[PDB]
Design an enzyme around this catalytic site. Structure first.
Site, PDB file in Angstrom:
ATOM      1  N   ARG A   1       0.846  -1.209   0.000  1.00 43.58           N
ATOM      2  CA  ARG A   1       0.000   0.000   0.000  1.00 43.58           C
ATOM      3  C   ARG A   1       0.871   1.244   0.000  1.00 43.58           C
ATOM      4  NH1 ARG A   1      -2.895   2.720   5.135  1.00 43.58           N
ATOM      5  NH2 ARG A   1      -3.978   4.436   4.082  1.00 43.58           N
TER       6      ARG A   1
ATOM      7  N   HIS B   1       0.679   4.140  -2.628  1.00 44.41           N
ATOM      8  CA  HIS B   1       0.316   5.519  -2.281  1.00 44.41           C
ATOM      9  C   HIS B   1       1.383   6.541  -2.630  1.00 44.41           C
ATOM     10  CE1 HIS B   1      -3.399   5.814   0.560  1.00 44.41           C
ATOM     11  NE2 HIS B   1      -3.573   4.841  -0.314  1.00 44.41           N
TER      12      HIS B   1
ATOM     13  N   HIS C   1      -5.927  -5.947  -3.395  1.00 39.23           N
ATOM     14  CA  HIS C   1      -6.756  -5.999  -2.193  1.00 39.23           C
ATOM     15  C   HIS C   1      -6.934  -7.397  -1.638  1.00 39.23           C
ATOM     16  CE1 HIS C   1      -8.557  -1.658  -2.391  1.00 39.23           C
ATOM     17  NE2 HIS C   1      -7.313  -1.716  -1.952  1.00 39.23           N
TER      18      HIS C   1
ATOM     19  N   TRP D   1     -10.709  -8.389   2.814  1.00 37.91           N
ATOM     20  CA  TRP D   1     -11.375  -8.683   1.546  1.00 37.91           C
ATOM     21  C   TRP D   1     -11.453 -10.207   1.366  1.00 37.91           C
ATOM     22  CZ3 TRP D   1      -7.644  -4.732   1.951  1.00 37.91           C
ATOM     23  CH2 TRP D   1      -8.056  -3.437   1.539  1.00 37.91           C
TER      24      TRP D   1
HETATM   25  C1  HEC Z   1      -1.575  -2.095  -6.135  1.00 39.43           C
HETATM   26  C2  HEC Z   1      -1.957  -1.573  -4.888  1.00 39.43           C
HETATM   27  C3  HEC Z   1      -3.199  -1.024  -4.563  1.00 39.43           C
HETATM   28  C4  HEC Z   1      -4.118  -0.333  -5.287  1.00 39.43           C
HETATM   29  C5  HEC Z   1      -4.005   0.033  -6.754  1.00 39.43           C
HETATM   30  C6  HEC Z   1      -5.126   0.110  -4.387  1.00 39.43           C
HETATM   31  N1  HEC Z   1      -4.918  -0.334  -3.142  1.00 39.43           N
HETATM   32 FE1  HEC Z   1      -6.048  -0.124  -1.525  1.00 39.43          FE
HETATM   33  N2  HEC Z   1      -4.717  -1.154  -0.454  1.00 39.43           N
HETATM   34  C7  HEC Z   1      -3.659  -1.852  -0.854  1.00 39.43           C
HETATM   35  C8  HEC Z   1      -3.146  -2.730   0.206  1.00 39.43           C
HETATM   36  C9  HEC Z   1      -2.158  -3.901  -0.015  1.00 39.43           C
HETATM   37  C10 HEC Z   1      -3.882  -2.491   1.272  1.00 39.43           C
HETATM   38  C11 HEC Z   1      -3.863  -3.245   2.641  1.00 39.43           C
HETATM   39  C12 HEC Z   1      -3.035  -2.358   3.607  1.00 39.43           C
HETATM   40  C13 HEC Z   1      -2.864  -2.975   5.021  1.00 39.43           C
HETATM   41  O1  HEC Z   1      -3.355  -4.092   5.292  1.00 39.43           O
HETATM   42  O2  HEC Z   1      -2.233  -2.296   5.856  1.00 39.43           O
HETATM   43  C14 HEC Z   1      -4.823  -1.473   0.885  1.00 39.43           C
HETATM   44  C15 HEC Z   1      -5.701  -0.872   1.780  1.00 39.43           C
HETATM   45  C16 HEC Z   1      -6.681   0.100   1.419  1.00 39.43           C
HETATM   46  C17 HEC Z   1      -7.618   0.686   2.328  1.00 39.43           C
HETATM   47  C18 HEC Z   1      -7.664   0.380   3.832  1.00 39.43           C
HETATM   48  C19 HEC Z   1      -6.552   1.130   4.573  1.00 39.43           C
HETATM   49  C20 HEC Z   1      -6.622   0.925   6.099  1.00 39.43           C
HETATM   50  O3  HEC Z   1      -5.617   0.480   6.691  1.00 39.43           O
HETATM   51  O4  HEC Z   1      -7.688   1.204   6.689  1.00 39.43           O
HETATM   52  C21 HEC Z   1      -8.424   1.584   1.639  1.00 39.43           C
HETATM   53  C22 HEC Z   1      -9.655   2.403   2.180  1.00 39.43           C
HETATM   54  C23 HEC Z   1      -7.988   1.443   0.281  1.00 39.43           C
HETATM   55  N3  HEC Z   1      -6.939   0.523   0.143  1.00 39.43           N
HETATM   56  C24 HEC Z   1      -8.615   2.129  -0.788  1.00 39.43           C
HETATM   57  C25 HEC Z   1      -8.229   1.999  -2.091  1.00 39.43           C
HETATM   58  C26 HEC Z   1      -8.936   2.652  -3.245  1.00 39.43           C
HETATM   59  C27 HEC Z   1     -10.124   3.611  -3.122  1.00 39.43           C
HETATM   60  C28 HEC Z   1      -8.269   2.290  -4.369  1.00 39.43           C
HETATM   61  C29 HEC Z   1      -8.548   2.599  -5.743  1.00 39.43           C
HETATM   62  C30 HEC Z   1      -9.905   2.703  -6.254  1.00 39.43           C
HETATM   63  C31 HEC Z   1      -7.138   1.459  -3.927  1.00 39.43           C
HETATM   64  N4  HEC Z   1      -7.176   1.177  -2.538  1.00 39.43           N
HETATM   65  C32 HEC Z   1      -6.194   0.958  -4.800  1.00 39.43           C
HETATM   66  C33 HEC Z   1      -3.097  -1.776  -2.130  1.00 39.43           C
HETATM   67  C34 HEC Z   1      -3.737  -1.051  -3.210  1.00 39.43           C
END
Ligand code: HEC
Ligand code: HEC
Lengths: 294, 108
Positions: free
Chosen positions: A48, A52, A175, A191
């Site tokens: 993540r 980001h 996810h 998820w």
């Molecule tokens: C290729 C990577 C990737 C993409 C692209 C991505 N995410 Fe995620 N996202 C993650 C990962 C991996 C986590 C789990 C993080 C953890 O467990 O600490 C996450 C966690 C999150 C979370 C939860 C964070 C928390 O700790 O509460 C949110 C809300 C989120 N993503 C929103 C989005 C949205 C909106 C989009 C796009 C529409 C998006 N993500 C696209 C990798 C991605």
């Protein structure tokens, strides 16, 4: 005179063996400090973090992106969209201290690549050469996606990262990793059940679970299933939109296909905004620890 | 691997923190992400009635005992390539012994 260009410059004498050493360092720490987040481990938050820090890119003026490694500065560090990422940052601090020569952007991105590979995901070719830029280059908050939106929003948002339907659906398969935490994003739950293994479970769950739209403790709505899984409104929009649904279905029925597309899209994500000299080295494909009899 | 009796209490903590996510141990307990483990020792892999196992797990056809269980938990995918159980493994012998000492009791 005119618009920003970011040229890849890899520090003198630093080569593949050097970066493999950094990869190993991250992979080893990932195994040693395994208690984090109820034993999910730091792999998901690292992925993540790579996303980001790269996702701030705006293809229209080449601002943001992984190049400058600006997440180290106050403004981006405290972007509410980044709540919880401080954990990945802290995880990488000692690593950077052991390998002071690596750039910040190179470290954040390599962290995501290492985490994906060590969680048995696809190999992600990676290229070194990101160069730290001054605080002034730090984009303002507001460039990362809102999760409470729909398919049209997802599609137009990702257009800013030069991503197409296929790339968007593939990248979202990340996810499968980790979970949402109410204290971080206002959403709660995983998820799926294989939180620290990179599979196509995201697509399988999207298509096979019975989802019910509900409010959570932070008063946001999310889609919940009986198995105890969740989908953010944006995740679920992938089966609400016809074009996205067809791609969801094909990844749900072919993981090797998902892996290949995700690999391409994630590297592209990680390299957006970067101009690589034509005489620059071929991307590196690091060996996993398992592949080193380790 | 060769099992050696350990601490059931520490094994219970290992189970709670590393296994409960996906498995229950009580007799007649429910299947979850993974199969209920009651009666696991002395039974062949992939035989828990009512659970949809992976093809690989069932074909391993291993008659579970304290020793091969230790081998399995050291590296699941290695022992049963293709299993869908997502778990890297307990690399420390002490950890595997405490856990199995507990599992032997909790399932029994
Ligand atoms: C290729 C990577 C990737 C993409 C692209 C991505 N995410 Fe995620 N996202 C993650 C990962 C991996 C986590 C789990 C993080 C953890 O467990 O600490 C996450 C966690 C999150 C979370 C939860 C964070 C928390 O700790 O509460 C949110 C809300 C989120 N993503 C929103 C989005 C949205 C909106 C989009 C796009 C529409 C998006 N993500 C696209 C990798 C991605
Ligand atoms: C999910 C994230 C799980 C965690 C954590 C653990 N297990 Fe697991 N286990 C899980 C699944 C989905 C399966 C099925 C495997 C398949 O390929 O079908 C299993 C299976 C086992 C088995 C075999 C059971 C049998 O053959 O009847 C054992 C003995 C087992 N799991 C033990 C176990 C222990 C002790 C765990 C933690 C240390 C553990 N599992 C974690 C899913 C998950």
């Amino acid at each position: 005179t005119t618009p920003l260009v970011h040229v890849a410059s890899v520090e003198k004498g630093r080569s593949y063996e050097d970066f493999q050493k950094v990869y190993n360092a991250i992979a080893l720490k990932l195994r040693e400090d395994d208690e984090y987040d109820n034993y999910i481990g730091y792999g998901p938050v690292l992925v993540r973090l790579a996303w980001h820090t790269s996702g701030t890119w705006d293809k229209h003026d080449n601002t943001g992106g992984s190049y400058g490694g600006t997440y180290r500065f106050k403004k981006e560090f405290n972007d509410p969209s980044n709540a919880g990422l401080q954990n990945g940052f802290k995880f990488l601090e000692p690593i950077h201290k052991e390998f002071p020569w690596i750039s910040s952007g190179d470290l954040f991105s390599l962290g995501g690549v290492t985490a994906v590979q060590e969680m048995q995901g696809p190999k992600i070719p990676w290229r070194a050469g990101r160069v730290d830029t001054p605080e002034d280059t730090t984009p303002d908050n507001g460039r990362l996606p809102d999760a409470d939106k729909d398919a049209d929003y997802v599609r137009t948002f990702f257009q800013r990262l030069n991503m197409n339907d296929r790339e968007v659906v593939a990248l979202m398969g990340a996810h499968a990793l980790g979970k949402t935490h109410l204290k971080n994003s206002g959403y709660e739950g995983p998820w799926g059940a294989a939180n620290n293994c990179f599979t196509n479970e995201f697509y399988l769950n999207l298509l096979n679970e019975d989802w019910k739209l509900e409010k959570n403790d932070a008063n946001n709505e999310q889609w919940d299933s009986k198995s105890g899984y969740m989908m953010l409104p944006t995740d679920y929009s992938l089966i609400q939109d016809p074009k996205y649904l067809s791609i969801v279905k094909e990844y749900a029925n072919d993981q090797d296909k998902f892996f290949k597309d995700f690999s391409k899209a994630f590297e592209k994500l990680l390299e957006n905004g970067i101009t690589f000299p034509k005489d620059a080295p071929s991307p590196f494909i690091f060996k996993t620890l398992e592949e080193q009899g380790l | 691997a060769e099992f050696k009796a350990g601490s059931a209490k520490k094994g219970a903590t290992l189970f709670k923190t590393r296994c409960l996510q996906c498995h229950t141990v009580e007799k007649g307990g429910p299947h979850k992400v993974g199969p209920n483990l009651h009666g696991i020792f002395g039974r062949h892999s992939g035989q828990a009635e009512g659970y949809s196992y992976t093809d690989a797990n069932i074909k391993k056809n291993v008659l579970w005992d304290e020793n091969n269980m230790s081998e399995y938990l050291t590296n699941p995918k290695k022992y049963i390539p293709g299993t869908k159980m997502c778990f890297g493994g307990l690399k420390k012998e002490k950890d595997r012994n405490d856990l199995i000492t507990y599992l032997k009791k909790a399932t029994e």
